[PDB]
Amino acid sequence: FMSSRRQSVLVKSNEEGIQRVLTSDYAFLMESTTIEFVTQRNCNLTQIGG
Amino acid sequence: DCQFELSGADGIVRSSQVEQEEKTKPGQAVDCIWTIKATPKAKIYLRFLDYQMEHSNECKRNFVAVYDGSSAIENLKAKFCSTVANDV
Ligand SMILES: *[C@@H]1O[C@H](CO)[C@@H](O[C@@H]2O[C@H](CO)[C@@H](O)[C@H](O)[C@H]2NC(C)=O)[C@H](O)[C@H]1NC(C)=O
Ligand SMILES: *[C@@H]1O[C@H](CO)[C@@H](O)[C@H](O)[C@H]1NC(C)=O
Ligand SMILES: *[C@@H]1O[C@H](CO)[C@@H](O)[C@H](O)[C@H]1NC(C)=O
Numbered sequence A: 001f002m003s004s005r006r007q008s009v010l011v012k013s014n015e016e017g018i019q020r021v022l023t024s025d026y027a028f029l030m031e032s033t034t035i036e037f038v039t040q041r042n043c044n045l046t047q048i049g050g
Numbered sequence B: 001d002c003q004f005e006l007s008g009a010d011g012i013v014r015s016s017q018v019e020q021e022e023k024t025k026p027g028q029a030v031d032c033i034w035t036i037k038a039t040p041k042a043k044i045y046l047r048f049l050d051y052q053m054e055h056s057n058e059c060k061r062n063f064v065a066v067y068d069g070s071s072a073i074e075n076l077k078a079k080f081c082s083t084v085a086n087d088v
Helices: A015-022 A035-041
Strands: B064-067 B075-079
Touching: none
Parallel strands: none
Antiparallel strands: B064 B075
């Protein structure tokens, strides 16, 4: 997927990965120690996998 | 002389007009080039709403190339003849 739509889904920060989930329908693949920080501040985001 | 001068916010250039604009004949070599003019202070984003080749992976007899400006290989972003055309 992400090779075919590289200008679409691949972003340039962890900050833009937050905003695309807050606004669009997005499933950002973040490292699991800044998922354990953003979901502490924003109670509307979550870690949906292991 | 398949000329297609057009501008605006958008515009849909199709393979339907190339038999309807009557600059071609069924079964002959075409060199029909679409010309895209932007609005002033703008940039162009070609996306594909449909793409279908009758001879896939055969970049000799059917292809779609994207020149960014004049007819130069200096500005040639992509040239598709496979099954899937990514957006430039
Ligand atoms: C209810 O859930 C939606 C998510 O489906 C919240 O987010 C909205 O999502 C749309 C696109 O999916 C975007 O315009 C914005 O991210 C959100 N829109 C608005 C108006 O907030 C939504 O915020 C939630 N809450 C309400 C009250 O609808
Ligand atoms: C998350 O989104 C909803 C919509 O406003 C709400 O429950 C909450 O205020 C948001 N989270 C934060 C930290 O603002
Ligand atoms: C583009 O926007 C202008 C105003 O910003 C508007 O007048 C114009 O009609 C728009 N273009 C088209 C093709 O409608």
